[PDB]
Symmetry: D2
Subunit: 290 residues, 4 copies
């Protein structure tokens, strides 16, 4: 029921570093109305979201839920810092109406798997909400074993997993071992291969600007029209190759400003986008998205 | 363009004393051609324990293979591995024997820069006059070549394709669009369905010695946009591969080939002999997936 | 130049409810200063589970540490981790409290290029006016900085040194010769003797909470060219460290500190509690190596 | 008794690719007389030695043993290809008089440890010679565990190990667990740190041209004169930094030609050394070695 394309909301910032509330609402509206996404992924690692305070993470969650209402599905990423920040955020967004959570493991310590399980099971026990897990524990690089997925999926309110690494063998194994769980692709350049292996959705940050093509790839592949889907994936990956060449986070923001959305400013010590990269973003915009 | 299809990576059987079992070799070729109905044979690949044999034992394998297969199937001769002079000597031997396509891994004895890899491949093409399939990863470096590096190699018209060994589907898709006129072979059997929908022209694998039927079906069904049926067969194939890998891939394939009446030969020291527990597991996999 | 010597990486003790155990914190400081006779304390480091605490809990730790240590030892305040605004806010807080040296890991939320790392460090130096020790590896990248990148950072005169976390002794030797006027700290206790003979000015480690005596001896004996005696103590130190690592380093250090009368506090969820088997093993190591 | 500095002999080649016999003798003489090395390491991975035939590997071993006689220790590396080539080479060099062997594991297969042990134990059983093992199985990157060293060192004719990776923690552990075995450093840039941890010798290819400084570092460190040894190591590493900057294999050969030794030609497809790199090798020669 949570299927479809999700855009990873990137939070825009004012000149002074605070959150640009009206700019945040404009990005939500652009994703819902123009990109016609099936959901929003709020609080993800995308861009520079993990640096903001707990207080500012809570204001972003409330602004998002009040502007999106339920035109779309919403998932709240509440992990990363530690387990009690995850629980406080998890019960705040549960009280705001967020019907699903996700959590990356904490960054301050390399936890064994038995502590990953306690971490995830505690967020489900203390919030009562649904949970999406990550196939890779935060900053470890190693995918979880298929046996470890089974131990986590024994909990019924852990309803899915977001794949960040493009291991399609493990993806296929998880897909067959757990036909009742949701699997989200977290790689936009390989959406077509993921869709034919039966993923239920995709979460990406390019879908802020390329959501239309992604919904077509997702829909055409689930109806076995591979010839047309591969051709759109070829065009999508020419956009992504240019965006990556040009700096992905800043190119997406610069393209959003070319579409009439105030995507805000960057926070130090990140270097400002150059004139050559602004002109290159406009060439990408006119070639692929206008 | 005629070299599309599923290829089996021939594994060389050995006698008790370590020499090659010529009649076991002929029976494996017949099994792949008649029962597996493969579209071609990949001879001389790194698969199993083939890189340990002498160049002269390599010449006898190439001659036995072309003489047992006739022209029922495509043949690709892997002539690299050791050095450039053995690659050229092997490359001209198998070209005179009738092989119409070559492949070559870079030599193992040195970490060559790209400008010396290109001279390596271009020299084998000039001295044999044969077609060439390159590897996306230089031997024992782990890093895929850049898309610009593919362009410099693909400037040669007798470098007709590339065998992908790492499952980087982003790079696979980029190479596919940048060079629509070149052949691309998947070298990963567990991900055949994803590679096929991105437009690979064939697959070279060692599981096709025993699972060639399912692989041909996945390849044909996916190229005809019937993903639902193709995904179910890929699921069954990966249940076999997961068991084969759990049990030791090289030895399980050999023991399964012996359960169907093919003399797969013996192992060479210092490789350990397969256990009774693994023979029984190979038999369960055989009865469950292939009988 | 006055900040040479052995430094202990303070591990913050926690109460049963997760808040910081202030009196346990004072007792750990006293144990390091009086019994271990360390030359300084490294406060706020990634060691153990310190990066999980709030900035406000970080401010109370910095204030407790400077007030318990007075000026018996050098103090370095690690103010990085979260972002640049917390680093600058922390950096000016501990500068007003009397800390004479800072260190900062790069932020964790983004993979910064080098030109943004340099702005990061130069901004903390300009906004606090304090001295700065950099890390040879940007937080969560794994790759050491280039020797040219060290030169661009060391152009700032208030960047007085570098803490090496990876044991690359070739790069350590190159940095040592290229910048004889800068401080270099080893951050690997198992290789103290090799780092000292290459001219490191000190060591920052977490084993020095309990093995500071042996580490000071290795440091002093090696800088006075008595390698034979220094190697024997390094052998004993590494027998302790091998046991500590086998048993879980963070929890074994805490349990050993409790065997000598220091309230090392409790663990925070989701970390698992130490077993009886590991408590008994910590006691054997204590009786064998430190009593 | 095998202590000291060993030079890794690099085989010079004629214009046609064959072995330059008189050039090989000249390199042996330069290492024995001018570099005053304590031994020669023949057949190692250095340069481009692993490509030559078994026949040409046998001629190199005999030329080396007949020109060096016993002015120096000799170790013969007989592994890499497969186990029966290792045994044939091992008994040939045992019949030539080589009193110690070494062997890297085969390249054609990723052997488990129980097959590494059978591999090494077979070369010792079939030749009766002494054996030096490598801490890293050929092309795997992973050091052996200290428990695995113990299982191998249970054989008394496996007398030592050559360390290729600079893990000084593992080096110190192996040194203490087996005080009766030889340990050779295989990293010239870190000779001083290795010497203070009690290594019995060093095997390197820079010792073809920098053997004098290396013997001084080795001798000064074993007599606790660290101040003088570190200063020579600083100078040695300035040479090595330049050699590496310039291409190590070709710079060493070009420096040997600047010292009056016919170090031969390169084999295709290796690119020939440039004029800028020849001039740079001469600057290194005049600055560090003349």
């Amino acid at each position: 029921f949570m299927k479809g394309i999700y855009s990873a909301l990137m939070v825009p910032y004012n000149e002074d570093g605070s959150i640009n509330e009206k700019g945040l609402r404009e990005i939500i509206r652009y994703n819902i109305d123009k990109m016609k996404v099936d959901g929003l992924y709020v609080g993800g690692s995308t861009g520079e979201n993990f640096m903001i305070s707990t207080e500012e993470k809570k204001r972003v969650f409330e602004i998002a839920i009040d502007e999106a209402k339920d035109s779309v599905n919403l998932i709240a990423q509440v992990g990363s810092i530690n387990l009690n920040e995850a629980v406080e955020l998890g019960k705040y967004v549960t009280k705001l109406g967020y019907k699903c959570l996700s959590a990356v493991t904490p960054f301050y310590y390399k936890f064994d798997f038995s502590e990953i399980k306690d971490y995830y099971e505690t967020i489900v026990r203390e919030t009562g909400n649904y949970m999406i897990i990550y196939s890779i524990p935060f900053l470890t690089g190693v995918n979880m074993s298929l046996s470890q997925f089974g131990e986590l999926f024994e909990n019924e309110k852990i309803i899915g997993v977001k794949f960040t690494a493009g291991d399609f063998y493990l993806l296929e194994r998880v897909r067959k071992a757990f036909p009742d769980k949701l699997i989200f692709a977290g790689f936009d350049e390989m959406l077509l291969p993921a869709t034919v292996l039966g993923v239920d959705g995709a979460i990406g940050s390019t879908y802020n600007i390329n959501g239309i093509r992604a919904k077509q790839i997702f829909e055409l592949a689930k109806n076995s029209k591979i010839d047309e889907a591969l051709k759109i994936q070829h065009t999508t990956n020419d956009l992504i190759e240019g965006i990556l060449s040009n700096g992905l986070y800043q190119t997406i923001k610069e393209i959003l400003k070319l579409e009439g959305v105030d995507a805000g400013y960057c926070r130090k010590p990140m270097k400002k986008i150059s004139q050559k990269q602004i002109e290159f973003a406009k060439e990408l915009h006119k070639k692929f998205l206008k």
